[PDB]
Amino acid sequence: SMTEYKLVVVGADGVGKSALTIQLIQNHFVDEYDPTIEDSYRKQVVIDGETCLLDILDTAGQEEYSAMRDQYMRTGEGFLCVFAINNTKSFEDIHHYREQIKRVKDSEDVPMVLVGNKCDLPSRTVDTKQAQDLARSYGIPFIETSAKTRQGVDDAFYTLVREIRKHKEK
Amino acid sequence: SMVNPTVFFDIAVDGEPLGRVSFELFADKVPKTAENFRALSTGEKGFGYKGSCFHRIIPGFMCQGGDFTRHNGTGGKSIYGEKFEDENFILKHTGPGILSMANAGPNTNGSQFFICTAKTEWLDGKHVVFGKVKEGMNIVEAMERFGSRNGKTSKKITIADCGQLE
Ligand SMILES: Nc1nc2c(ncn2[C@@H]2O[C@H](COP(=O)(O)OP(=O)(O)NP(=O)(O)O)[C@@H](O)[C@H]2O)c(=O)[nH]1
């Protein structure tokens, strides 16, 4: 079999959206910060025995340009909603991303995964339980990741594909 | 102008001269912000724009540069410290040639700046406009062609020399 999924990576600036994506696509960790405007990637993977093409849209962490960002959300089938475990503001921003996705998709059931990135760092400010509780209240998975060590990177993207597939089954 | 300084950038493409862009800096209306750009253009404080890159060029919108500290689009510093406050929003992003401060939110002006190649009115009230291209808009239009949709440039566009005129 083969299928294809449009994945969109969203979240506040500097949380590691690009570093997570670049680990998945290019298998290296970018230590320098290169702020995103917009980037797109394609990769063929096998998830649960089912081959698929991932189209990943790496978006900029910013709340300006609502109409452009709404178009990303209309076209996207699932969303990785990323915060950094050492940036409380980025965690507090998550509910705004979920609200925008639901409004644009006109649905309360949109494939989404909550990603707590930078778990390698010793400067945590957001507790795992806090993030788990938020994800539970949304009915979505929570994955802790480190783009630096690659921990959880495949899991985050593959889990999102699983969420899309479960949504398509309804 | 009898009041507003004129500064110039000699633009280079992979080291080769492209041409000169001069700017009127609106010290009459935006004095602190104009003075920062003037001083960074002369290098008189011991640091400034000479050698730095236009790291983000998006056709239809703007050419952005001015990171002379990190050299990667994340840096910059003013003559007043790392950051200074938004001085005023008297002037707007009315069209091509407008020179305005880049920032990372309220009161974070440093050295990064952008030159508009179109009206960018959604930036009004959030970025401080402080100057305009005087001569060499054709050179800015030539720079714009090295950009791309995400701002990455296909050749390295730099300020090979800069200073104050008149
Ligand atoms: N230690 C550590 N640093 C990380 C991790 N992920 C990203 N970083 C660092 O955090 C900075 C920002 O990462 P980046 O992926 O560019 O963030 P972004 O969310 O894409 N930013 P933007 O919204 O501006 O495009 C970079 O210096 C990067 O190396 C991680 O898991 N661990």
Ligand SMILES: [Mg+2]
């Ligand atoms: Mg990014």
